Amino acid sequence: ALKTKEHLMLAALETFYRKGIARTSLNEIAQAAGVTRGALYWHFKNKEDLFDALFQRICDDIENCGSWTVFRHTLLHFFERLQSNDIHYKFHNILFLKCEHTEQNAAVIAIARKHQAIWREKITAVLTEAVENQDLADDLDKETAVIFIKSTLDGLIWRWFSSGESFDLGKTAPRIIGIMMDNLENHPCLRR
Amino acid sequence: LKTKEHLMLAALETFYRKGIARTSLNEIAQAAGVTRGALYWHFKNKEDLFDALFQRICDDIENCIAQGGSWTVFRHTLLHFFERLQSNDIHYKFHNILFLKCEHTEQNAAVIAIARKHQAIWREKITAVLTEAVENQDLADDLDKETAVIFIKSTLDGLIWRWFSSGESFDLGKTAPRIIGIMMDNLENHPCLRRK
């Protein structure tokens, strides 16, 4: 039963990746899945639900893989998987490059915003554990730190996709991550 | 030419409302209050209007950099970029369009090609700032210039993306100077940005 839901969302992933989210229709997804519109509707009422499910599959894969070191490993595995996992590659390609913030995509954008809030809470908890464990300074500005972490990671992703993958992500990401973590631990501009 | 600028801002406003892919030349002409023939005389297609907007953005930046040491000027230029991103409607709308309303589809392939040309321009300009800073001994002689440019663009693009994509939910005036100061400290001191 989970295989029928998976076939439809992967057909959605393929159509989104080719046409973008705004121009993708339910009929195209159903056609690409080789199913009827009614069969698609049985599992997913709309593009929002397909995109949201894609978000959950990405987050499930990440979570199914001390605390400050695990975070570092998680960031490194994330960028490796962007190069080796076709679903993670295409999903983030869609999110950053094929998902325009227009009124037409408002409900898809609302789903994306819900997942940004979730990443925010997960990073904030990582920082909290690192502070109590003395991996980070007691006067760390956690709010600025979260913005800093997300901006660093988003910049590398956006830059990699928008450049047409014109630089080696396997060599670049550990260096970007290493500088980021050094800044979080030591740079005074990230303190209250 | 004031007739050309009227057309470019009609394109900017329509791009900002509808996105680049869904905008048609007729809508731009209509919004500018001119005929399709009048528009085509100055701009053959959406790409060239987008290209002209890119140039106005670059002209604005260069006519302000024209106002000690080039490395300190670079700091000011970066700070001024994010300030006008928040205070100048043309710079706000254009970069909003670029990051959030310009999807990388086959339909937009020609627009994307224009953007790629201007990324190459920014890359060359950042490389020249880096070359000057090394020659002025503001940056180490063994700076990895290739990684540093990628590093600079990634830091700045990430902040812009984050600000727009979050719905401007944090204070850019207070956040960008911290980000810039850290970025420039890393370029000056961090060993990961060295060739060795």
Numbering used by the authors:
A (entry chain A): 8 to 72, 83 to 209
B (entry chain B): 9 to 75, 82 to 210
Q: What did the publication describing this PDB structure actually write?
A:
Neisseria gonorrhoeae responds to host-derived antimicrobials by inducing the expression of the mtrCDE-encoded multidrug efflux pump, which expels microbicides, such as bile salts, fatty acids, and multiple extrinsically administered drugs, from the cell. The mtrCDE genes are organized in a three-gene operon, and their expression is repressed by the divergently transcribed transcription regulator MtrR, which is a dimeric TetR family member with a predicted N-terminal helix-turn-helix (HTH) DNA binding motif and a C-terminal dimerization/inducer-binding domain. As in other bacterial multidrug-binding regulators, MtrR likely responds to the influx of multiple cytotoxins into the cytoplasm by dissociating from the mtrC promoter and relieving repression of mtrCDE gene expression.
The native structure was refined to 2.0-Å resolution with final Rwork and Rfree values of 20.4% and 24.7%, respectively. The subunits of each dimer are composed of nine α helices. MtrR has two distinguishable functional domains: an N-terminal DNA binding domain with a helix-turn-helix (HTH) motif and a C-terminal dimerization/ligand-binding domain. The dimer interface is formed primarily by the burial of hydrophobic residues in the middle of a four-helix bundle that is formed by α8 and α9 of each subunit. As observed in all other TetR family members, the multidrug-binding pocket of MtrR is located in the C-terminal domain with ligand-binding residues contributed from all C-terminal helices except α9. The initial solvent-flattened electron density map revealed positive electron density in each of the four independent putative ligand-binding pockets of each MtrR protomer, suggesting a “ligand” was fortuitously captured during the purification or crystallization process. The density could be fit by CAPS, the biological buffer component of the MtrR crystallization reagent.
